[PDB]
Amino acid sequence: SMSVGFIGAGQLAFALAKGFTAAGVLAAHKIMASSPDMDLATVSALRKMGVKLTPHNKETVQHSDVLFLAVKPHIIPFILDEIGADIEDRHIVVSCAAGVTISSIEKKLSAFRPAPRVIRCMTNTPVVVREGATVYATGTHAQVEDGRLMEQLLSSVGFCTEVEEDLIDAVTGLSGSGPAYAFTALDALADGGVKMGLPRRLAVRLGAQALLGAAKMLLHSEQHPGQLKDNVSSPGGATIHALHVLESGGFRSLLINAVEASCIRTRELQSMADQE
Amino acid sequence: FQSMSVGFIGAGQLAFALAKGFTAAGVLAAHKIMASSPDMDLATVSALRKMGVKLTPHNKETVQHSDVLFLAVKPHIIPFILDEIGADIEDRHIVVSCAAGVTISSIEKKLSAFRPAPRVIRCMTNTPVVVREGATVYATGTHAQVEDGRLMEQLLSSVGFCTEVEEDLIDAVTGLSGSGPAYAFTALDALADGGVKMGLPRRLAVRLGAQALLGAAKMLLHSEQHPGQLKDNVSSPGGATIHALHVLESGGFRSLLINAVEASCIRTRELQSMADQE
Amino acid sequence: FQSMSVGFIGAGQLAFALAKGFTAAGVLAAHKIMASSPDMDLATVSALRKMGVKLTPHNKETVQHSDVLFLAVKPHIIPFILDEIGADIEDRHIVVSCAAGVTISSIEKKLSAFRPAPRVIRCMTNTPVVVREGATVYATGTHAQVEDGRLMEQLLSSVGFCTEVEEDLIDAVTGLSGSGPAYAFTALDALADGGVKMGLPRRLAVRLGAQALLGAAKMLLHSEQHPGQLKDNVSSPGGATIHALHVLESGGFRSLLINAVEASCIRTRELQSMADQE
Amino acid sequence: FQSMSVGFIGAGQLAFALAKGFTAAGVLAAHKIMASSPDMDLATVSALRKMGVKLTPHNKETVQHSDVLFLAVKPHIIPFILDEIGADIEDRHIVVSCAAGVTISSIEKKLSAFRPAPRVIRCMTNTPVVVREGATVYATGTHAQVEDGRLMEQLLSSVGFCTEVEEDLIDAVTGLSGSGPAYAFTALDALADGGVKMGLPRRLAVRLGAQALLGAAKMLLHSEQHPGQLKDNVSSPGGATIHALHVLESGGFRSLLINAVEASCIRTRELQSMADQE
Numbered sequence A: 001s002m003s004v005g006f007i008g009a010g011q012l013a014f015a016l017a018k019g020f021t022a023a024g025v026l027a028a029h030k031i032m033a034s035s036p037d038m039d040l041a042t043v044s045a046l047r048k049m050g051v052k053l054t055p056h057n058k059e060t061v062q063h064s065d066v067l068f069l070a071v072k073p074h075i076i077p078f079i080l081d082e083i084g085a086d087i088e089d090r091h092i093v094v095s096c097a098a099g100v101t102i103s104s105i106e107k108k109l110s111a112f113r114p115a116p117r118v119i120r121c122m123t124n125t126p127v128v129v130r131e132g133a134t135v136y137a138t139g140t141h142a143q144v145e146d147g148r149l150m151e152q153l154l155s156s157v158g159f160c161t162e163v164e165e166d167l168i169d170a171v172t173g174l175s176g177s178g179p180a181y182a183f184t185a186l187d188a189l190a191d192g193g194v195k196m197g198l199p200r201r202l203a204v205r206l207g208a209q210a211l212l213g214a215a216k217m218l219l220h221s222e223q224h225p226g227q228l229k230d231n232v233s234s235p236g237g238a239t240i241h242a243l244h245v246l247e248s249g250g251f252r253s254l255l256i257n258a259v260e261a262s263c264i265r266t267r268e269l270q271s272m273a274d275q276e
Numbered sequence B, C, D: 001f002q003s004m005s006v007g008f009i010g011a012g013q014l015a016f017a018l019a020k021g022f023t024a025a026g027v028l029a030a031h032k033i034m035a036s037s038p039d040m041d042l043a044t045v046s047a048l049r050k051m052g053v054k055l056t057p058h059n060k061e062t063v064q065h066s067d068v069l070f071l072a073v074k075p076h077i078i079p080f081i082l083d084e085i086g087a088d089i090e091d092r093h094i095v096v097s098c099a100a101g102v103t104i105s106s107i108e109k110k111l112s113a114f115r116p117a118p119r120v121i122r123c124m125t126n127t128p129v130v131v132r133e134g135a136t137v138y139a140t141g142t143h144a145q146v147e148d149g150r151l152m153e154q155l156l157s158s159v160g161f162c163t164e165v166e167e168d169l170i171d172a173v174t175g176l177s178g179s180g181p182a183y184a185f186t187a188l189d190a191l192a193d194g195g196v197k198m199g200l201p202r203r204l205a206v207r208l209g210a211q212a213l214l215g216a217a218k219m220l221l222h223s224e225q226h227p228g229q230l231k232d233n234v235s236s237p238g239g240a241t242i243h244a245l246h247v248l249e250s251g252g253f254r255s256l257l258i259n260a261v262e263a264s265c266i267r268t269r270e271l272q273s274m275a276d277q278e
C-alpha cells in the first residue's frame, strides 16, 4: 500500500529500491525516483526494475508517503527549498545524506509547514543484497509509529536499529564506508592467493566466502573476536605466523585510522555546510 | 544420505564445527555421528555430547562405526592415528583428511601398508562451517572412486562453498580461506576499536562492523563486477570513504594482507616439509 | 617432607630467589638448604648466609647434604659440574636442572656414565619466585618416579604457579615467562617516564604503573573473559583509554612483544644447538 | 565505621568493581551499599543484586541511603545528576566523584547553588579494585574535613593502593594507572600470541604471561632497586633475554608506552576543556 519516493535516483536509490523489492515489501511501481538527468545509468537500472522515474522532484513528493532524500549532502539545502512547500502533514521525510543534521532539515522545512516529520538515517550499499547496516534517529515531530515504521522497512534489507543522532557520523565512518574497506581487503587477499599460485577467480571466491563466514560467525557468537581468533590459531601454525606479519605492519592501526578519517571528514564537510 | 555413518578422529574445534554444521543443515542426524578423543573432559567434547553425537575414547570404535571417516587431529598426530587404525580400514571406508599440509601420498603410503587401495580425500575448510558458510576445497586420492568426490562435495556443500581442486593448490587455499577468518576477526576487532574511538558503544560498533563485512562480501559474491568497481561505487568525490581509503593506502594495507596469505601458505609448506623429513 | 634436604649447585641469583621464596613460604627452613659456589665472597652468597642457608665452596658437600638437588649454574657450566658430581649421585637424589636450554637427555647421558637411572627433572622458572609469584614449568625425565613430579610440583607451587609440561615446550616457556619479567621491567620504566612527562613525581609514577600492571594481571588470572574483552571494558567511547590504545597500535606494540618472545625462544634454541655441537 | 552507608549514583562497571572489592575485603556488607541506574535491566545491575547490593532506579533514594556517595556515571552526565540531587545533599554527605576529568571546582559550583559547603572528594581509580589490587588517588575539596580524607583513604586502601594527591596530578594519573590496565591487557594478549607462535597452547601462554607480569610488578613494588637494575639481573650475557630486549628497543617499545600515557592524559584534559566550555 505504501508509496515510496527517492529524491535523487542514484546509487543509493537503486540499492534501496532493489533491496525493498527483493524483500517483497514494496512493489517496484509503488516507488518513484527523480533526477535532473533522466538518461543516467542508475536511472536506466531503476526503470528496468519497474520504478517510476521523473525529472520533477515535486512529482516524487506528491507521489510519496515515505520520502527518502538521496542526493549528495551539498544538494540537500537546495531541494529542501525546492519542495519544502510540497511537504504535507502525511509525509515522513527520511534523509539518507551523510553528515546532514536533523536540525538543518527541520529548520528549512519548518518555514513552510510547522511540524515536518523527519528521520535521519545512515545505511550502506549492501542493502542491495538485503544485508545492509542501518541506523536511524527520529526528529522533533516524528511520531512513535514513524520510527517503528522506518525500522520495519529498513529491517527488510539488513540490520536496523535506532540511535541518538550524535552517533551517526561515527556510524558513517564504520559501516557507511565499511564496504569499501572490505572490497579493498578482498582485492588484496585475492592478490595474495594469486601470488601463492591460485587462479584469480578461485582466490576471489575463497577470500569473499572467508570474510562472509567469519562475519556471520561473529554475529552468531557470544565470544569476543579475540577468542574466535584464538580458536583459529594453532600453536606454531600457519595462522599465527600470518597474524604476526599483520601485526608487524600495524594492520589494526590502519583500520582505526580509516574509521577515524571517514568520521572526521564527515564532520568536517557538515561544518562547511553549516558555515555556508 | 540416511544410510551414511560419519565419524571423526579427534573431537576438537573442527569436529564440533563440522558436526554442528552438518546437523544444522539436516544432512546428518547427530546420532549417526561418532567422535573420538583421548580427553573426554574437553569443552568441544561436552558440546558434541549435547548435540547427540556419540563419543568414545577409542579411535577403533569410531572406525568401526563410520563409513566416512574425518581425520580431525592436529597434523603431527595424523601418522600416529594412521598406524593405530590402519588395520581397521575396510573397503567401505572413505578417509577424509582435514589436516593442514598433510599430503594424500603420505596418507595413502601409511594406509597401504595394511590394505591396498585406501579411498582417501584431502580437504581444507574453515571454522565458519559452524554457521554453514564455510569455504572448502578437496582433492581426490589415487583410489577414490568418482562417486566418492561427488559424495564428499554434496556433504561439504551443505555447510558452505565447496569445490574440487588439484592437490597442489591446497596449501595456498590454507593461507587464504583456512587462515582467513582470523584475518577477519582481527580486522573486525580493529574496526570496532575505531568505532569506539569515534564515540560508538562497543557492542554497536562490533555489530555494525561485522554486518558491513558480511554485506560487502555477499555483494561481491552476488555481483559480476570487479571489487574495484564496487569500491568505486562507495567512494563519492571529495567524500568520507575516499579520505579513509587514502589512509589505508598510506599504510600499505593491501601489502599486509598479501604478506599474511603468503606467510600462512609458506608456513604450511614448511611444516609439511619438516614432517616429510621425519 | 619437613625432613627433606635441598641443595643448590650455584649460589647465584636464582638460588637466592628460590631459597628466599621457599623460606618465606615456610615449606623449608633455611637450615635445610645448602648452596655451593667457588667464590664464597659473592653478594648472593652473603645474602643466602644471612637467611640461614648453609654455604660451602665444595659441590660434593652440597650433593651429600641434599635429597632434592637444584642445578643453578649457567648453562655452559652444567656439563662441567655433572662430570664433577656424577660419581656422588645416589639412589635418593632428585636432580632438578634449572638451566636454560639444557636438555634432560644431555643431563641423563652425563650422569648415567657414573651410575644408571639418575632421577632428573628439568624446570624453567623466573625471578619472581623471590616474592612467591613465580611462573614455573617442569618436565620429568626417564627415571623420575611419579612421586618425584608430584614432590617437585608441591615444592615449586609454594613460590608461584607451577605445572607439568612436555619438555619440548620449555624453550618457548623460557621466551615467555622466563624472559617475561624483563619485558615488564622495561615497560614499567617507560610507563613511569610517561607519567613523569605528564607531571607526576617519579616515585609515584613507578608505584602507580607497577600497581596497574599487577592489578591487571591479577584480573586476567581471576577472570573467565578474554583479555580483549577486559580491554573493551576499560575503553569508554571517545575516551582517554581508546585514544591511548590507538597510539600503541600505530607503533605495532603487539608485534614488538611477539618479536620478543620469538627472539628469546630462538636464542634459547640456538644456544643449546651450539652446546650440543660441542 | 561498620555503620557507614555507601551509595553509587551509576550502577555500571566501576560501581560493580568497587562494590565487589569492598565486600570481598569485608570492610562493607553488601546490604550497606545502594546503587542506582535508570535501567534496572543492566547486567552490572544484576551482578550487584546477586552480591546483595540494594538497587533502585531513583537517584534520590541512593542519596537518602548514603553517607559516602560515589558518583560513578560517565563524565558528561555528572552535571545532570548534580542538578538532580543537589537539593538532597545534607550536612552528613561526603560526595566522592570518580568521573574522569571532572574538577572539584565544577562539582562544588553545582552543589553550592543548592546548599553551601558540600564535602567533595575527587578520585581516580581503576578496574583492578575488583580483585583488591586497584591503584587509587584522591584529592580533597574546599569543605572536606580532615577526617573525610582519612575515611576515604581507609576505605579505598581496602581494595588496593591509595594515596592523597594534589588535584592537578589526577589527569596524569588517569593516563597512567586509569588507562594502565588496558595497556597490560593489550600486552598480555600479544605476549600470549608470541607464546602460541613458538608452540605453546593458548591457555598456557595466557596463564604464564599474566603470571610473569604479576610477579614482575610485585618484585618492583617490593624492591628498593631501579627497574633497570631488576632488568639487568634478568639479562644474562649473550643470553635469550638480552636478545629479546634488543628487538623491543629496535621497535621503540619504550616510546610507545610514553606515547600512550601522554595520549590518555591529553585526551582527558581535552574532554574536560570541552565540558568547561559547555
Ligand SMILES: NC(=O)C1=CN([C@@H]2O[C@H](COP(=O)(O)OP(=O)(O)OC[C@H]3O[C@@H](n4cnc5c(N)ncnc54)[C@H](O)[C@@H]3O)[C@@H](O)[C@H]2O)C=CC1
Binding pocket: A007, A008, A009, A010, A011, A012, A013, A015, A034, A035, A036, A037, A040, A042, A057, A069, A070, A071, A072, A073, A075, A078, A079, A096, A097, A098, A122, A123, A124, A125, A176, B233, B234, B236
Ligand atoms: N551510496 C551509498 O551506498 C550510500 C549513500 N548515502 C547517501 O546517499 C546520498 C546519495 O548517495 P549516492 O546515491 O551515492 O550519490 P549518487 O551521486 O550516485 O546519486 C546522486 C543522485 O542525485 C541526483 N541529483 C543531483 N542533483 C539533483 C537535484 N537537484 N534533484 C534531484 N536529484 C538530484 C544525481 O543526478 C544522482 O542521481 C548521499 O547523500 C550519500 O551520502 C548514505 C548511505 C550509503
Ligand SMILES: NC(=O)C1=CN([C@@H]2O[C@H](COP(=O)(O)OP(=O)(O)OC[C@H]3O[C@@H](n4cnc5c(N)ncnc54)[C@H](O)[C@@H]3O)[C@@H](O)[C@H]2O)C=CC1
Binding pocket: A231, A232, B009, B010, B011, B012, B013, B014, B015, B036, B037, B038, B039, B042, B044, B059, B071, B072, B073, B074, B075, B077, B080, B081, B098, B099, B100, B124, B125, B126, B127, B178
Ligand atoms: N580449526 C579449524 O578451523 C580448522 C582446522 N583444520 C584442521 O583440523 C585438524 C584439527 O584442528 P582443530 O580441531 O582446530 O584442533 P583441536 O586441537 O581443537 O582438536 C584436536 C583434537 O584431536 C584430539 N586428539 C589428540 N590426540 C588424539 C589421538 N591420538 N586420537 C584421537 N584424537 C586425538 C584432541 O584431544 C582434540 O580433541 C587440524 O589438522 C587442523 O589443521 C582444517 C581447517 C580448519
Ligand SMILES: NC(=O)C1=CN([C@@H]2O[C@H](COP(=O)(O)OP(=O)(O)OC[C@H]3O[C@@H](n4cnc5c(N)ncnc54)[C@H](O)[C@@H]3O)[C@@H](O)[C@H]2O)C=CC1
Binding pocket: C009, C010, C011, C012, C013, C014, C015, C017, C036, C037, C038, C039, C042, C044, C059, C071, C072, C073, C074, C075, C077, C080, C081, C098, C099, C100, C124, C125, C126, C127, C128, C178, D233, D234
Ligand atoms: N635468574 C633467574 O631468574 C633464572 C635463571 N635460570 C637459570 O638458572 C641458572 C643460573 O641463573 P643465575 O642464578 O641467574 O646465574 P648467576 O650467574 O647469578 O649465578 C650463577 C652461580 O653459579 C656459580 N658457579 C660458577 N661456576 C660454578 C661451579 N663450578 N660450581 C658451582 N657453582 C658455580 C657462580 O659463582 C654463581 O653463583 C642459569 O642456568 C639460568 O638459565 C632459570 C630461570 C630463571
Ligand SMILES: NC(=O)C1=CN([C@@H]2O[C@H](COP(=O)(O)OP(=O)(O)OC[C@H]3O[C@@H](n4cnc5c(N)ncnc54)[C@H](O)[C@@H]3O)[C@@H](O)[C@H]2O)C=CC1
Binding pocket: C233, C234, D009, D010, D011, D012, D013, D014, D015, D017, D036, D037, D038, D039, D042, D044, D059, D071, D072, D073, D074, D075, D077, D080, D081, D098, D099, D100, D124, D125, D126, D127, D128, D178
Ligand atoms: N571503569 C573503571 O574502571 C573506571 C571508571 N572511572 C569513571 O567512573 C565513571 C563510570 O565508569 P563506568 O562504570 O566504566 O561507566 P559505565 O558506563 O559502565 O556505567 C555507567 C553507569 O551510569 C548509569 N547512568 C546513566 N545515566 C544515569 C543517570 N541519569 N543516573 C544514574 N545513573 C546513570 C548507566 O546506566 C551505567 O550503569 C566514569 O566517569 C569513569 O570515568 C574511573 C576510574 C576507573
Ligand SMILES: CC(C)(C)[C@H](O)C(=O)O
Binding pocket: A232, A233, A234, A237, A238, A239, A240, B100, B125, B126, B174, B175, B178, B179
Ligand atoms: C585452518 C588452519 C590450518 C590455517 C589453522 O588456522 C592453523 O593455523 O593451523
Ligand SMILES: CC(C)(C)[C@H](O)C(=O)O
Binding pocket: A098, A123, A124, A172, A173, A176, A177, B234, B235, B236, B239, B240, B241, B242
Ligand atoms: C556511505 C558514505 C556516505 C560514507 C559514502 O561512501 C561517501 O564516502 O560519501
Ligand SMILES: CC(C)(C)[C@H](O)C(=O)O
Binding pocket: C234, C235, C236, C239, C240, C241, C242, D100, D125, D126, D174, D178, D179
Ligand atoms: C579509567 C578511564 C577513565 C581511563 C577509562 O578507561 C576511560 O577511558 O574513560
Ligand SMILES: CC(C)(C)[C@H](O)C(=O)O
Binding pocket: C100, C125, C126, C174, C178, C179, D234, D235, D236, D239, D240, D241, D242
Ligand atoms: C630466565 C632466562 C633463562 C630467560 C634468563 O633471563 C636468560 O636470559 O638467560
